[PDB]
Design a protein around this nucleic acid. Sequence first.
DNA 1: TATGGATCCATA
DNA 2: TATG
DNA 3: GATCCAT
Lengths: 209, 206
Amino acid sequence: MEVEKEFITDEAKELLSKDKLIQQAYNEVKTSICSPIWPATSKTFTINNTEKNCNGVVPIKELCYTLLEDTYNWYREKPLDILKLEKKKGGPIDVYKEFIENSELKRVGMEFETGNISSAHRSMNKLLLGLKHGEIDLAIILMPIKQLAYYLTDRVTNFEELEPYFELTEGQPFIFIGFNAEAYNSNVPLIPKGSDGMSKRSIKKWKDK
Amino acid sequence: MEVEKEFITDEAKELLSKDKLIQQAYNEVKTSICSPIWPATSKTFTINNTEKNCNGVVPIKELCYTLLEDTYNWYREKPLDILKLEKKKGGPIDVYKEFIENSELKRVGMEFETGNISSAHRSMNKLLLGLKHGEIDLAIILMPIKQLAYYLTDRVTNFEELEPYFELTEGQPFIFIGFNAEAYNSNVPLIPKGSDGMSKRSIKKW
DNA sequence: TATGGATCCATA
DNA sequence: TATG
DNA sequence: GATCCAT
Ligand SMILES: [Mn+2]
Ligand SMILES: [Mn+2]
Protein backbone atom coordinates (compact mmCIF):
# COMPACT_ATOMS: atom_id res chain seq x y z
CA MET A 1 0.00 0.00 0.00
CA GLU A 2 1.29 3.55 -0.48
CA VAL A 3 0.73 7.10 0.78
CA GLU A 4 -0.61 9.48 -1.89
CA LYS A 5 -2.25 12.41 -0.15
CA GLU A 6 -1.45 14.05 3.14
CA PHE A 7 -2.20 17.14 5.20
CA ILE A 8 0.01 18.20 8.11
CA THR A 9 -1.01 21.15 10.31
CA ASP A 10 1.60 23.82 11.03
CA GLU A 11 1.90 22.53 14.60
CA ALA A 12 2.54 18.96 13.40
CA LYS A 13 5.08 20.37 10.88
CA GLU A 14 6.97 22.01 13.73
CA LEU A 15 7.14 18.79 15.75
CA LEU A 16 8.25 16.78 12.73
CA SER A 17 11.08 19.18 11.96
CA LYS A 18 12.60 19.61 15.43
CA ASP A 19 11.59 16.53 17.44
CA LYS A 20 13.26 13.13 17.08
CA LEU A 21 10.54 11.18 18.95
CA ILE A 22 7.80 12.61 16.69
CA GLN A 23 9.93 11.89 13.61
CA GLN A 24 10.25 8.30 14.84
CA ALA A 25 6.48 8.05 15.46
CA TYR A 26 5.70 9.41 12.02
CA ASN A 27 8.11 6.97 10.34
CA GLU A 28 6.66 3.94 12.16
CA VAL A 29 3.18 5.03 11.06
CA LYS A 30 4.26 5.57 7.45
CA THR A 31 5.96 2.15 7.23
CA SER A 32 2.90 0.47 8.77
CA ILE A 33 0.35 2.09 6.43
CA CYS A 34 2.49 1.08 3.44
CA SER A 35 2.75 -2.55 4.64
CA PRO A 36 -0.68 -3.85 3.58
CA ILE A 37 -0.44 -6.13 0.54
CA TRP A 38 -3.06 -8.17 -1.36
CA PRO A 39 -3.42 -11.01 -1.94
CA ALA A 40 -1.62 -12.50 1.10
CA THR A 41 1.19 -13.83 -1.10
CA SER A 42 1.92 -10.59 -2.95
CA LYS A 43 4.54 -7.92 -2.47
CA THR A 44 2.15 -5.09 -3.39
CA PHE A 45 -1.50 -4.27 -2.82
CA THR A 46 -3.57 -4.97 -5.91
CA ILE A 47 -7.27 -4.21 -5.48
CA ASN A 48 -9.93 -6.09 -7.48
CA ASN A 49 -11.65 -3.48 -9.62
CA THR A 50 -14.54 -5.43 -11.15
CA GLU A 51 -17.15 -2.96 -9.90
CA LYS A 52 -18.04 -0.08 -7.64
CA ASN A 53 -17.89 -0.95 -3.94
CA CYS A 54 -16.90 -4.56 -4.66
CA ASN A 55 -14.45 -4.95 -1.73
CA GLY A 56 -14.77 -5.22 2.02
CA VAL A 57 -12.60 -2.99 4.21
CA VAL A 58 -11.57 -5.07 7.24
CA PRO A 59 -8.71 -7.21 5.81
CA ILE A 60 -7.01 -4.01 4.52
CA LYS A 61 -6.07 -2.85 8.04
CA GLU A 62 -4.63 -6.10 9.44
CA LEU A 63 -0.98 -5.86 8.29
CA CYS A 64 -0.70 -2.23 9.33
CA TYR A 65 -2.11 -2.94 12.81
CA THR A 66 0.07 -6.05 13.16
CA LEU A 67 3.27 -4.11 12.40
CA LEU A 68 2.31 -1.24 14.73
CA GLU A 69 1.48 -3.65 17.56
CA ASP A 70 3.97 -6.47 17.12
CA THR A 71 6.95 -4.69 15.62
CA TYR A 72 6.55 -1.14 16.88
CA ASN A 73 4.74 -1.86 20.17
CA TRP A 74 1.81 0.52 19.69
CA TYR A 75 -1.26 -0.26 21.83
CA ARG A 76 -4.93 -0.42 20.92
CA GLU A 77 -7.98 1.00 22.64
CA LYS A 78 -6.49 3.81 24.74
CA PRO A 79 -9.21 5.49 26.80
CA LEU A 80 -8.97 9.26 27.18
CA ASP A 81 -9.25 10.48 30.76
CA ILE A 82 -11.69 13.25 29.87
CA LEU A 83 -14.08 10.66 28.40
CA LYS A 84 -13.61 7.61 30.61
CA LEU A 85 -12.96 9.34 33.93
CA GLU A 86 -14.32 12.87 33.71
CA LYS A 87 -17.39 12.66 31.47
CA LYS A 88 -17.61 8.86 31.83
CA LYS A 89 -19.10 8.68 28.33
CA GLY A 90 -17.24 7.79 25.16
CA GLY A 91 -15.05 5.04 23.77
CA PRO A 92 -11.25 4.75 23.49
CA ILE A 93 -8.81 5.93 20.86
CA ASP A 94 -7.89 3.37 18.18
CA VAL A 95 -4.08 3.23 18.33
CA TYR A 96 -1.78 4.82 20.89
CA LYS A 97 1.89 4.83 21.90
CA GLU A 98 4.17 6.66 24.34
CA PHE A 99 7.60 7.53 22.97
CA ILE A 100 10.36 8.15 25.49
CA GLU A 101 13.88 9.55 25.40
CA ASN A 102 15.39 10.15 28.83
CA SER A 103 13.11 12.75 30.45
CA GLU A 104 11.00 13.38 27.34
CA LEU A 105 7.60 11.69 26.88
CA LYS A 106 5.61 12.05 23.65
CA ARG A 107 2.14 10.48 23.40
CA VAL A 108 0.72 9.91 19.91
CA GLY A 109 -2.93 9.06 19.27
CA MET A 110 -3.99 7.51 15.98
CA GLU A 111 -7.06 6.31 14.15
CA PHE A 112 -7.11 3.92 11.21
CA GLU A 113 -10.45 4.90 9.62
CA THR A 114 -12.26 2.49 7.27
CA GLY A 115 -15.68 3.18 8.76
CA ASN A 116 -18.32 5.43 7.20
CA ILE A 117 -17.16 8.98 6.41
CA SER A 118 -19.37 10.24 9.28
CA SER A 119 -17.39 8.05 11.68
CA ALA A 120 -14.21 9.84 10.50
CA HIS A 121 -15.81 12.97 12.00
CA ARG A 122 -16.22 11.25 15.39
CA SER A 123 -12.62 9.96 15.18
CA MET A 124 -11.32 13.45 14.43
CA ASN A 125 -13.43 14.96 17.22
CA LYS A 126 -12.24 12.45 19.83
CA LEU A 127 -8.58 12.99 18.92
CA LEU A 128 -9.24 16.74 18.99
CA LEU A 129 -10.74 16.38 22.49
CA GLY A 130 -7.66 14.46 23.65
CA LEU A 131 -5.36 17.09 22.14
CA LYS A 132 -7.28 20.01 23.65
CA HIS A 133 -7.09 18.27 27.01
CA GLY A 134 -3.35 17.68 26.80
CA GLU A 135 -3.60 13.91 26.72
CA ILE A 136 -1.85 13.42 23.37
CA ASP A 137 0.86 15.49 21.69
CA LEU A 138 0.04 14.44 18.13
CA ALA A 139 -3.08 13.11 16.37
CA ILE A 140 -3.07 11.03 13.18
CA ILE A 141 -5.81 9.68 10.92
CA LEU A 142 -5.17 7.10 8.20
CA MET A 143 -7.76 6.64 5.47
CA PRO A 144 -8.13 5.49 1.87
CA ILE A 145 -8.17 8.08 -0.92
CA LYS A 146 -11.30 8.59 -3.06
CA GLN A 147 -9.98 6.44 -5.93
CA LEU A 148 -9.38 3.46 -3.64
CA ALA A 149 -12.64 4.08 -1.74
CA TYR A 150 -14.55 3.70 -5.02
CA TYR A 151 -13.84 -0.04 -4.93
CA LEU A 152 -14.43 -0.47 -1.19
CA THR A 153 -17.65 -0.61 0.83
CA ASP A 154 -19.98 2.30 0.03
CA ARG A 155 -19.46 5.55 1.95
CA VAL A 156 -16.19 4.51 3.62
CA THR A 157 -13.99 7.34 4.89
CA ASN A 158 -11.86 8.89 2.15
CA PHE A 159 -9.27 11.68 2.29
CA GLU A 160 -11.09 13.99 -0.17
CA GLU A 161 -14.46 13.89 1.62
CA LEU A 162 -13.08 14.69 5.09
CA GLU A 163 -10.65 17.27 3.63
CA PRO A 164 -13.06 20.26 3.83
CA TYR A 165 -13.00 19.71 7.61
CA PHE A 166 -9.25 19.50 8.23
CA GLU A 167 -9.40 23.18 9.20
CA LEU A 168 -11.32 22.36 12.39
CA THR A 169 -8.02 21.02 13.78
CA GLU A 170 -6.37 24.43 13.51
CA GLY A 171 -4.18 25.23 16.49
CA GLN A 172 -3.48 21.53 17.02
CA PRO A 173 -0.79 19.08 15.82
CA PHE A 174 -2.66 16.86 13.36
CA ILE A 175 -1.71 14.64 10.42
CA PHE A 176 -4.13 13.21 7.86
CA ILE A 177 -2.85 10.40 5.61
CA GLY A 178 -4.51 9.06 2.48
CA PHE A 179 -3.36 5.75 1.05
CA ASN A 180 -3.91 4.07 -2.31
CA ALA A 181 -3.30 0.62 -3.77
CA GLU A 182 -0.36 0.05 -6.11
CA ALA A 183 -2.47 -1.72 -8.73
CA TYR A 184 -6.09 -2.18 -9.85
CA ASN A 185 -6.89 -5.54 -11.38
CA SER A 186 -9.78 -8.00 -11.68
CA ASN A 187 -7.34 -10.94 -11.45
CA VAL A 188 -6.94 -10.72 -7.66
CA PRO A 189 -9.71 -12.08 -5.39
CA LEU A 190 -12.20 -9.70 -3.81
CA ILE A 191 -11.54 -8.60 -0.25
CA PRO A 192 -14.37 -10.45 1.61
CA LYS A 193 -17.28 -8.65 3.27
CA GLY A 194 -18.98 -9.47 6.54
CA SER A 195 -17.84 -12.42 8.67
CA ASP A 196 -15.47 -13.73 5.98
CA GLY A 197 -13.45 -10.51 6.09
CA MET A 198 -12.73 -10.88 9.78
CA SER A 199 -10.15 -12.73 11.89
CA LYS A 200 -8.35 -9.62 13.05
CA ARG A 201 -6.43 -11.72 15.65
CA SER A 202 -5.86 -11.00 19.34
CA ILE A 203 -4.84 -7.35 19.63
CA LYS A 204 -2.40 -5.60 21.99
CA LYS A 205 -4.77 -3.58 24.21
CA TRP A 206 -3.56 -0.73 26.39
CA LYS A 207 -5.54 -2.14 29.33
CA ASP A 208 -2.93 -4.80 28.55
CA LYS A 209 -2.16 -7.67 26.22
CA MET B 1 -42.90 15.56 20.65
CA GLU B 2 -41.53 17.46 23.64
CA VAL B 3 -38.16 19.00 24.49
CA GLU B 4 -36.61 17.13 27.43
CA LYS B 5 -32.93 18.06 27.36
CA GLU B 6 -31.01 21.12 26.23
CA PHE B 7 -27.53 22.61 26.16
CA ILE B 8 -27.08 26.27 25.25
CA THR B 9 -23.58 27.69 24.99
CA ASP B 10 -22.97 30.99 26.75
CA GLU B 11 -22.85 32.82 23.41
CA ALA B 12 -26.28 31.46 22.44
CA LYS B 13 -27.53 32.35 25.95
CA GLU B 14 -26.62 36.01 25.44
CA LEU B 15 -28.34 36.04 22.05
CA LEU B 16 -31.48 34.46 23.49
CA SER B 17 -31.61 36.84 26.43
CA LYS B 18 -30.87 40.04 24.50
CA ASP B 19 -31.81 39.56 20.84
CA LYS B 20 -35.44 39.59 19.72
CA LEU B 21 -34.80 37.91 16.32
CA ILE B 22 -32.93 34.98 17.91
CA GLN B 23 -35.76 34.62 20.45
CA GLN B 24 -38.27 34.40 17.59
CA ALA B 25 -36.08 31.83 15.78
CA TYR B 26 -35.60 29.72 18.93
CA ASN B 27 -39.36 29.94 19.53
CA GLU B 28 -40.08 28.73 15.97
CA VAL B 29 -37.70 25.76 16.09
CA LYS B 30 -39.11 24.68 19.46
CA THR B 31 -42.72 24.71 18.29
CA SER B 32 -41.51 22.83 15.22
CA ILE B 33 -39.66 20.13 17.17
CA CYS B 34 -42.73 19.64 19.36
CA SER B 35 -44.88 19.25 16.22
CA PRO B 36 -44.27 15.60 15.17
CA ILE B 37 -47.08 13.31 16.38
CA TRP B 38 -47.77 9.56 16.18
CA PRO B 39 -49.90 7.91 15.00
CA ALA B 40 -51.29 10.30 12.37
CA THR B 41 -54.69 10.24 14.07
CA SER B 42 -53.17 11.59 17.30
CA LYS B 43 -52.36 15.01 18.74
CA THR B 44 -49.31 13.69 20.61
CA PHE B 45 -46.38 11.37 19.91
CA THR B 46 -46.61 7.83 21.25
CA ILE B 47 -43.72 5.49 20.53
CA ASN B 48 -44.32 1.73 20.27
CA ASN B 49 -42.25 0.19 23.07
CA THR B 50 -42.72 -3.51 22.30
CA GLU B 51 -39.03 -4.17 21.71
CA LYS B 52 -35.64 -2.43 21.77
CA ASN B 53 -34.86 -0.74 18.43
CA CYS B 54 -38.30 -1.75 16.99
CA ASN B 55 -39.11 1.56 15.25
CA GLY B 56 -37.63 3.04 12.09
CA VAL B 57 -36.87 6.78 12.12
CA VAL B 58 -37.66 8.31 8.71
CA PRO B 59 -41.25 9.61 9.32
CA ILE B 60 -40.30 11.42 12.55
CA LYS B 61 -39.02 14.68 11.00
CA GLU B 62 -41.82 15.26 8.48
CA LEU B 63 -44.06 17.47 10.66
CA CYS B 64 -41.07 19.34 12.07
CA TYR B 65 -39.93 20.24 8.56
CA THR B 66 -43.46 21.02 7.32
CA LEU B 67 -44.00 23.66 10.01
CA LEU B 68 -40.56 25.27 9.61
CA GLU B 69 -40.92 25.48 5.83
CA ASP B 70 -44.60 26.33 5.35
CA THR B 71 -45.59 28.10 8.55
CA TYR B 72 -42.21 29.62 9.36
CA ASN B 73 -40.61 29.93 5.92
CA TRP B 74 -37.28 28.28 6.74
CA TYR B 75 -35.20 27.12 3.76
CA ARG B 76 -34.35 23.42 3.40
CA GLU B 77 -30.94 22.11 2.30
CA LYS B 78 -29.07 25.42 2.36
CA PRO B 79 -25.56 25.01 0.85
CA LEU B 80 -22.82 26.84 2.72
CA ASP B 81 -20.44 28.91 0.61
CA ILE B 82 -17.27 27.39 2.09
CA LEU B 83 -18.48 23.96 1.01
CA LYS B 84 -20.37 24.70 -2.21
CA LEU B 85 -18.36 27.62 -3.59
CA GLU B 86 -14.93 27.60 -1.99
CA LYS B 87 -14.06 23.95 -1.30
CA LYS B 88 -16.51 22.51 -3.83
CA LYS B 89 -16.94 19.49 -1.54
CA GLY B 90 -19.73 18.74 0.93
CA GLY B 91 -23.52 18.95 1.01
CA PRO B 92 -26.00 21.44 2.61
CA ILE B 93 -27.34 21.95 6.14
CA ASP B 94 -30.95 20.82 6.81
CA VAL B 95 -32.62 24.14 7.46
CA TYR B 96 -31.63 27.80 7.38
CA LYS B 97 -33.40 31.13 7.71
CA GLU B 98 -32.60 34.82 7.85
CA PHE B 99 -34.37 36.93 10.47
CA ILE B 100 -34.44 40.62 9.58
CA GLU B 101 -35.22 43.73 11.62
CA ASN B 102 -33.70 46.29 9.23
CA SER B 103 -30.04 47.07 10.01
CA GLU B 104 -29.97 43.82 11.97
CA LEU B 105 -29.67 40.45 10.26
CA LYS B 106 -29.53 37.08 12.02
CA ARG B 107 -28.97 33.89 10.06
CA VAL B 108 -29.75 30.61 11.80
CA GLY B 109 -28.63 27.19 10.60
CA MET B 110 -30.05 23.94 11.93
CA GLU B 111 -29.63 20.18 11.63
CA PHE B 112 -32.36 17.68 12.47
CA GLU B 113 -30.39 14.64 13.58
CA THR B 114 -31.80 11.11 13.27
CA GLY B 115 -28.90 9.53 11.40
CA ASN B 116 -26.24 7.38 13.07
CA ILE B 117 -24.55 9.07 16.06
CA SER B 118 -21.37 9.42 13.92
CA SER B 119 -23.38 11.46 11.42
CA ALA B 120 -24.18 13.89 14.25
CA HIS B 121 -20.45 14.65 14.33
CA ARG B 122 -20.51 15.58 10.65
CA SER B 123 -23.56 17.80 11.25
CA MET B 124 -21.97 19.54 14.24
CA ASN B 125 -18.74 20.12 12.27
CA LYS B 126 -20.57 21.52 9.23
CA LEU B 127 -22.49 23.95 11.44
CA LEU B 128 -19.09 24.76 12.99
CA LEU B 129 -17.65 25.64 9.56
CA GLY B 130 -20.63 27.88 8.86
CA LEU B 131 -20.21 29.63 12.19
CA LYS B 132 -16.45 29.93 11.78
CA HIS B 133 -16.97 31.38 8.30
CA GLY B 134 -19.58 33.88 9.46
CA GLU B 135 -22.34 32.31 7.34
CA ILE B 136 -24.66 31.78 10.30
CA ASP B 137 -24.96 33.50 13.69
CA LEU B 138 -26.36 30.48 15.55
CA ALA B 139 -26.32 26.71 15.10
CA ILE B 140 -28.90 24.27 16.43
CA ILE B 141 -29.15 20.48 16.45
CA LEU B 142 -32.34 18.48 17.20
CA MET B 143 -31.95 14.84 18.27
CA PRO B 144 -33.76 12.21 20.35
CA ILE B 145 -32.74 11.57 23.92
CA LYS B 146 -31.47 8.09 24.80
CA GLN B 147 -34.77 7.01 26.39
CA LEU B 148 -36.64 7.59 23.17
CA ALA B 149 -33.72 6.33 21.02
CA TYR B 150 -33.90 3.00 22.76
CA TYR B 151 -36.94 2.14 20.67
CA LEU B 152 -35.60 3.55 17.38
CA THR B 153 -33.15 1.94 14.96
CA ASP B 154 -29.90 0.97 16.66
CA ARG B 155 -27.14 3.59 16.97
CA VAL B 156 -29.15 6.64 15.90
CA THR B 157 -28.01 9.95 17.39
CA ASN B 158 -29.02 10.48 21.02
CA PHE B 159 -28.42 13.61 23.11
CA GLU B 160 -26.38 11.86 25.82
CA GLU B 161 -23.91 10.31 23.37
CA LEU B 162 -23.00 13.53 21.54
CA GLU B 163 -22.99 15.41 24.84
CA PRO B 164 -19.35 14.74 25.75
CA TYR B 165 -18.44 16.57 22.53
CA PHE B 166 -20.63 19.65 23.07
CA GLU B 167 -17.52 21.42 24.42
CA LEU B 168 -16.04 21.49 20.90
CA THR B 169 -18.42 24.38 20.17
CA GLU B 170 -16.91 26.62 22.86
CA GLY B 171 -17.00 30.24 21.75
CA GLN B 172 -19.77 29.73 19.20
CA PRO B 173 -23.54 30.31 19.55
CA PHE B 174 -24.74 26.69 19.72
CA ILE B 175 -27.90 25.04 21.01
CA PHE B 176 -28.38 21.29 21.36
CA ILE B 177 -31.87 20.00 22.12
CA GLY B 178 -33.02 16.48 22.98
CA PHE B 179 -36.63 15.61 22.23
CA ASN B 180 -38.73 12.79 23.69
CA ALA B 181 -42.11 11.19 23.00
CA GLU B 182 -45.13 11.97 25.20
CA ALA B 183 -45.92 8.31 25.75
CA TYR B 184 -44.54 4.82 25.22
CA ASN B 185 -47.39 2.37 24.76
CA SER B 186 -49.50 -0.13 22.82
CA ASN B 187 -50.41 0.95 19.31
CA VAL B 188 -52.09 0.15 16.04
CA PRO B 189 -48.78 1.12 14.35
CA LEU B 190 -44.99 0.81 14.71
CA ILE B 191 -42.81 3.30 12.79
CA PRO B 192 -41.83 1.39 9.58
CA LYS B 193 -38.21 0.68 8.62
CA GLY B 194 -36.33 0.97 5.36
CA SER B 195 -34.01 -1.70 3.90
CA ASP B 196 -30.89 0.35 4.62
CA GLY B 197 -27.50 -1.10 5.48
CA MET B 198 -27.60 -4.39 7.35
CA SER B 199 -31.40 -4.73 7.29
CA LYS B 200 -32.37 -8.28 6.29
CA ARG B 201 -34.16 -6.70 3.32
CA SER B 202 -31.07 -5.04 1.81
CA ILE B 203 -29.36 -6.62 -1.19
CA LYS B 204 -26.02 -8.18 -0.31
CA LYS B 205 -24.19 -9.92 -3.14
CA TRP B 206 -21.49 -11.44 -0.89
C1' DT C 1 -29.34 2.26 28.11
C1' DA C 2 -22.05 0.90 25.89
C1' DT C 3 -19.50 2.09 21.57
C1' DG C 4 -16.83 2.05 17.10
C1' DG C 5 -17.95 0.06 13.29
C1' DA C 6 -19.36 -2.15 8.32
C1' DT C 7 -22.45 -2.30 4.78
C1' DC C 8 -26.18 -0.82 1.93
C1' DC C 9 -30.14 3.02 0.58
C1' DA C 10 -32.31 7.20 -1.74
C1' DT C 11 -31.91 10.90 -4.83
C1' DA C 12 -29.19 14.22 -6.91
C1' DT D 1 -22.21 12.01 -10.55
C1' DA D 2 -21.67 12.91 -4.78
C1' DT D 3 -23.50 13.27 -0.12
C1' DG D 4 -26.59 12.82 3.86
C1' DG E 1 -28.86 8.88 5.88
C1' DA E 2 -30.46 4.48 8.04
C1' DT E 3 -30.13 -0.38 9.32
C1' DC E 4 -27.83 -3.75 11.92
C1' DC E 5 -22.93 -6.14 13.74
C1' DA E 6 -19.00 -7.46 16.89
C1' DT E 7 -17.18 -6.87 21.30
MN1 LIG F 1 -28.39 17.34 5.97
MN1 LIG G 1 -30.29 15.70 8.94
